[model samples]
Target chain A: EVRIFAGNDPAHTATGSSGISSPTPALTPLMLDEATGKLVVWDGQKAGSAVGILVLPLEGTETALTYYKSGTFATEAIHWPESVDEHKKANAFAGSALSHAA
Target chain B: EVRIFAGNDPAHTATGSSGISSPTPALTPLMLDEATGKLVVWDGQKAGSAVGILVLPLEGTETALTYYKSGTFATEAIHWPESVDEHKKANAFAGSALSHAA
Candidate 1:
């Protein structure tokens, strides 16, 4: 379960600071709690650690002004990066963040 | 919330191996899964390392050997140590164990 839940794919084995780079999306989140659900900071956590507190529900369809990114005004909607390179990191990062919580 | 939820009382400032000892029952339990509930090892986790897998609901009443200790047969019922000294450790340990999952 941890494998699928974590999206621990074999394609992206090396750390960016390590061997040759590869591409693959991984599931990860920023703030995840049982009661509070989860939040994603738009292009933040995977975008060079930029701080975006835009919390997103674990699963959902969204409308304006629902998410409030830290250090920014509330957001009704957010569009993630299209690049698979960035997408891979952002995906995995969000899923892994869930583990950081309860 | 973590403080209250964790029952991080100041009374437990020192470990048992350290100087002096005291008495106070802490709310601890073993195998605590959010979806599956919890299991308290009776006099085990607190009592000198005997393994008891008697899983108990986070909150409830029960009967019959509902708990199955690791390395032993199932337990329909369990009686924890009466000493407050052991009770404190067992209590805190149980609450802490829940964090081990998810």
Candidate 2:
């Protein structure tokens, strides 16, 4: 089953073999749609926000990659500092740089 | 190969079938220890912080679970608003509540 967590700074929380630390009691817990598994912020109504984060399955397969490329996310609500295009270029550069590595 | 991204508000960025957007040029790119795969905030020295995040493989299996429970993370660096114990109880309660659901 999909799990929900609430934390003031869940993004900054420790992540490793131990999983995410439990959410704080003071904040509203982050939830994912039980069915869709999309991250949503609930305030009587379901919305998505950065304050409360939803956890998703991280499988390194096309299916997982597809989720990242699909419209499954609430993009506007979740703002990144950079655009998608920039990330691709950086990766390409990295790949090129690494190609010369011994 | 493991990929790295740099973004100001990546955690708050859009996610879907499309992969994460590119990293911003202004910020120092976040990197993963290619060998360990642990999220480390890089400086002249490698460190971890909430400002930049590392992406990890998200497989829902014992291996993934082990990562959450292991000592792989820098718990002190990543500060969550709540203690780990509080999260455990919440999940337990959630499990119980869901048990009765159809």
Candidate 3:
């Protein structure tokens, strides 16, 4: 199942894990494949699952493409294509796009 | 209109349709355009409607942009802009960024 989880640390070490781990560095955001059910990771890093935090569904395909080309977004959106056993609903708090201080 | 859906058994067939159907890999992710009201499917796959699941909305105009550029993102968000007949509102269980098992 694809699960989005955001945290303050890249290591994602926290109770309830909610907060910006890094200070918005020049990092590329991850991406998910809907058809092939695959996750293309950034920096040529291959993994069965992509993980990170601070996610937001941007508007416009060109816009999203531009961002990816600019190397600002990290292409990694945790994916478990073998099964969809998770939240059967939509927009069910996939995870905090932006973290809040506890 | 944009819609996101995720399932474990791909072909998504289950009592609520929820679960991780496959593992992640080098497949490009998907993207959506709000202005043109169109979904630029991955691999330049043009379609009035894109399918698959486990969707997440990334952040920043650039981050999302790059993800789409490198072809890491598949570029699909199920759009029905011909008349926005579905969920005129915003953020209402559009789909599972992560699927849950039934």
Predicted complex 1: DockQ? 0.03
lDDT of 2: 0.23
| Per-residue lDDT of candidate 2, residues A1-102 (tens digit) | 222211122222211121223332222223323333322222223222122222343322211100110112222333222333433322221211010010
1 or 2: which has the higher lDDT?
1
Return the TM-score for candidate 1, rounded to 2 decimals: 0.18
lDDT of 1 by residue, B1-102 (tens): 223222121111211111112221233323332343333333333312222233323222332223322111112122334453422322222111111110
| Every prediction: chain A TM-score | 0.19, 0.18, 0.21
Candidate 1 segments whose C-alpha is farther than 4 A from its true place:
A1-3, A7-41, A44-80, A84-102, B1-3, B6-102
- Per-residue lDDT value at A43 in model 1: 37
Poorly placed runs, candidate 2 (over 4 Å): A1-29, A43-102, B1-102
lDDT per residue for candidate 3 within A1-102, as digits (tens), equals 422222222222111122222333222233345454332222212221123322333222212221111111211343222333232111111121211111
- CA shift at B89, candidate 2, in angstroms? 25
**Cα error, candidate 3, residue B37 (Å):** 12
